[PDB]
Design an enzyme around this catalytic site. Structure first.
Site, mmCIF file in Angstrom:
data_model
loop_
_atom_site.group_PDB
_atom_site.id
_atom_site.type_symbol
_atom_site.label_atom_id
_atom_site.label_comp_id
_atom_site.label_asym_id
_atom_site.label_seq_id
_atom_site.Cartn_x
_atom_site.Cartn_y
_atom_site.Cartn_z
ATOM 1 N N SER A 92 -8.094 -4.195 -2.235
ATOM 2 C CA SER A 92 -6.539 -4.348 -2.339
ATOM 3 C C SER A 92 -6.326 -3.327 -3.677
ATOM 4 O O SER A 92 -5.210 -2.907 -3.590
ATOM 5 C CB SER A 92 -6.128 -5.449 -2.701
ATOM 6 N N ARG A 125 -4.459 -0.185 -2.711
ATOM 7 C CA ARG A 125 -3.018 -0.169 -3.113
ATOM 8 C C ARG A 125 -2.728 1.175 -4.186
ATOM 9 O O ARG A 125 -1.545 1.781 -4.084
ATOM 10 C CB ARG A 125 -2.816 -1.551 -3.626
ATOM 11 N N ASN A 129 -0.537 3.855 -2.445
ATOM 12 C CA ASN A 129 0.689 4.270 -3.267
ATOM 13 C C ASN A 129 0.688 5.644 -3.643
ATOM 14 O O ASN A 129 1.711 6.371 -3.655
ATOM 15 C CB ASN A 129 0.687 3.285 -4.188
#
Lengths: 211, 75, 52, 69, 75, 75, 75, 75, 75, 75, 75, 75, 75, 52
Positions: A149, A153, A157
């Site tokens: 994660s 992420r 991102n």
């Protein structure tokens, strides 16, 4: 499938060409930046990457230089201005490389030394106090799954922000703020690469130094 | 008619009022680390910089919520 | 991004990073160890020569 | 370097004199790194040698029992 | 029409404004642990690191709420 | 159509924005207990550990609210 | 159709975002009582324990609100 | 259909998120009164107990709001 | 059907979540006035009691809002 | 039917949750002015009373919002 | 029917819960400026009055929002 | 009928409860800069004025949100 | 009719109440960096200024949310 | 109306490249004084000091 050729060929050509270029610099020399780059990168990475010790030998500098130089092409392509043909390799290779590299590096690095006895029998005091079997599954699944994660992420991102800012900034009308807004892409790519390399090296050294 | 209100309300509600904790925590951590690092120079070399590692947890805080925004757009 | 992306993106970055780091570890380690070997040899030779 | 005069007074005569600059001495709360430009802060100096630069780059470890900053 | 509004409103309302407490607590704990850990040398690595164990409770705070997001998508 | 909005709104509203007090209290208690416990040696492990018992009350605060989430799903 | 939205909205709104004050007050009282109780030895167990009596008021704060949740279910 | 939504929404909104100020003020007053009352001996029981009288005002703050809950049920 | 939702929503929304500022301010003023008034003897009863006059302003803060509740019931 | 919901929602939403800032600022200013004014004798009545002038700004803060309540009733 | 709900909801939501930051900042600035200005004599009237200039920014903060209320009434 | 509720709800929700962070930050920065700037003479006008430059960021915080209000009126 | 409510509610909710964390963090970081940098001039050259680098993270916090506003207008 | 990319790209690239390269050329170009001065001064000072 005949589609997805510019992303795989352009990403694999630029990634493999810039990543598989350290074999010719073994004999030297080469210029005035060899002593500053080798001394600053080796001294800064070896002196700042505290936590390895009994982890590995060439995997720290090889994985850090190869992961930073090889993974820097997905976020360093924000200056290239000009439709879903060369942007999926950054988001797919970023999350797939971060999750596959973190899970394969943590499981392979943790299942090599010590070891199978600590990971195959993690009960007793860690799951018998606490007699219910929920602390080992929740703590082990959350701590062992937090890297997918965090890496997915941060990499998703960073790649989504760099690709969206490069495509939206290069595919617009005027060339003022969109063509001159290089501070967010340069600062986001440099901070994302330094934070991803420092967080990956510190997480691998800290997670590999204790069992 | 539920795709526009569900996708827009899901992306705005899931990626809207959530950065207050991360933006406030970054300013509070920067002010506390700046005051503690400025009050002692010897401690501004291998201690206060460790607080920057806390910024690495920001990606697991509200910044991860933006990762769900694609579920209201791309997915 | 519809299909055939996980094998190319995963095999390209995994095979390129693993194949590049595994085959480039001795070249970058031996080629980059000249600063630590020369600095340790000069510092150890100067300190050992001065102390001796 | 040298900047502000950081003279030390003992129980009888004078203990130390001369100017000082980046005096990295420990305060009352713990280890601190003061230099030239600090405000007035009366602290306490306990036992322990503190490496502080005196004059013309004289980093001497002044060790004493008691002390009042 | 209740599946889009119920799933989107449940995922956005259940995984939206919730990271403010974890992000604020991480910055407050990082600033307080950085100032208290930097104010003393012997306390730099003897008890202050135990404060990092408090971060382990974050997975049982708002981070666990994301575990319910699948109930508004996969389940 | 009231089961999807009632169950989703009850599970999201009852198990959504509630971990801010527990996550903020865990970071505030960890930072204050870490600074007060690290500022003194004898106070490092004699009474400060009792503050960890306060964490046991978290299960009776927001963490208990998750226990009602089954009422919006299993019950 | 008003029983599902009224009972679910009453149980979620009445037993949802309310534990932030009790969970924040428990952590603030635990950190302040731990720092003040650990800063002095004689004050470690003479009056600081009286602060724990303040926790007895938590049952009359948000914890009492859960007592109304049955009104949205059993009653 | 307005009796269930008006009574349930009135009792939940009128007796829901309101104990944050009372529970936070009780913990802040207990921690400040415990630290200030424990830091000095003569100040242990001479005026600090008067701070407990401030708790008597809580019944006229959020606790009085529960007195209106009957208006959404009994009245 | 607007009298039940308008009167109940007006009385609950106008006399509901509003006592957090008065209840938190009473505890903060009681704790600060108790610590500052207890830290010194001469300051125990000479000016600190004037802080109690600030409580007289509470009737002009959230407590005045309850005065509007009759507008949703008696008026 | 829009007059009851518009006037009730406008008076409750415009004169509801708004006294938290004024009531919190009155207690914070009273506690800080009481501690700072009581910590010194000469500062008991020379400039601290000027802080009471800050209370005059409260009438231009949330207390002015009540002035708009007539727009949802008399006007 | 959208003029009453749009104008009332726009005036109440645009001129409702917004004075908490200005009223809290006025009390915090008055308490901090009163304690810092009263703690020293020379600082009683030399630079502390400049903090009152910060109050001039309040007219550009929440007080300016009231300027938009006419858009929901006169305009 | 969506233009009145969309424009009014967009202007009120986009230019309503948002000035609390800027108004609170202006008062906190003015009080902290006034106390720290008034506590020392040499620090009265050498670096503390640089804190006023932080006010220049307010135009990029909530004050920029008002720039979107025209999108709910002029655009 | 879902385009006006979804676009206006998505742009207002996604670009509305979100600047409180950035504006509060900028004022807290400016006040803490101004007090710490003002209390020691030697640290006002290459330490407290580093706190300004934390402002660079604000563009990745609430300021990035405005980047999604075009999704409720241009996209 | 137009684009005007040569002014922004040339001014930003020449200004950032000249300022960053000229101002950062001392850290990357002057870094050889540690290994060069340590190896030359270490070997010459160690051989001459040990011989004398």
């Amino acid at each position: 499938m005949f589609f997805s050729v510019v992303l795989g060929l352009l990403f694999l050509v630029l990634f493999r060409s810039v990543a598989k270029k350290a074999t010719s610099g073994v004999p030297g020399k080469f210029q005035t930046a060899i002593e500053l780059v080798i001394g600053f990168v080796n001294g800064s990475v070896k002196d700042m990457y505290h936590g390895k010790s009994k982890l590995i030998a060439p995997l720290a500098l090889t994985i850090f230089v190869w992961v930073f130089l090889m993974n820097l092409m997905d976020l360093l392509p924000i200056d290239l201005l000009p439709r879903v043909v060369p942007s999926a390799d950054v988001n797919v290779t970023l999350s797939m490389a971060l999750g596959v590299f973190i899970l394969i590096l943590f499981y392979s690095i943790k299942m090599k030394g010590i070891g199978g006895f600590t990971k195959e029998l993690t009960l007793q005091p860690f799951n018998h106090w606490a007699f219910i079997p929920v602390n080992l599954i929740l703590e082990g699944v959350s701590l062992l799954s937090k890297p997918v994660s965090l890496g997915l992420r941060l990499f998703g991102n960073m790649y989504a922000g760099e690709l969206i800012f490069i495509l939206i900034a290069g595919l617009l009308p005027w060339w003022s703020q969109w063509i001159l807004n290089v501070p967010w892409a340069i600062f986001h790519i440099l901070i994302i690469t330094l934070q991803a390399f420092i967080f990956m090296v510190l997480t691998i050294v800290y997670l590999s130094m204790a069992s | 008619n539920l795709n526009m209100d569900l996708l827009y309300m899901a992306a705005a509600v899931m990626m809207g009022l959530a950065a207050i904790g991360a933006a406030i925590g970054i300013g509070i951590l920067g002010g506390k680390f700046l005051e503690g690092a400025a009050r002692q120079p010897d401690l501004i070399p291998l201690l206060r910089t460790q607080f920057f590692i806390v910024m690495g947890l920001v990606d697991a805080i509200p910044m991860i919520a933006v990762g769900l925004g694609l579920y209201v757009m791309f997915a | 991004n519809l299909n055939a992306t996980i094998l190319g993106q995963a095999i390209a970055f995994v095979l390129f990073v693993l194949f590049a780091m595994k085959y480039v570890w001795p070249p970058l380690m031996a080629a980059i160890e000249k600063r630590q070997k020369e600095i340790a040899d000069g510092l150890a030779s100067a300190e050992r020569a001065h102390k001796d | 370097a040298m900047t502000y005069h950081l003279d030390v007074v003992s129980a009888e005569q004078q203990m130390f004199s001369g100017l000082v600059e980046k005096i990295q001495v420990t305060g009352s709360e713990g280890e601190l790194g003061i230099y030239p430009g600090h405000a007035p802060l009366l602290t306490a100096i306990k036992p322990g040698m503190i490496r502080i630069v005196k004059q013309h780059g004289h980093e001497e470890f002044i060790y004493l029992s008691g002390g009042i900053l």
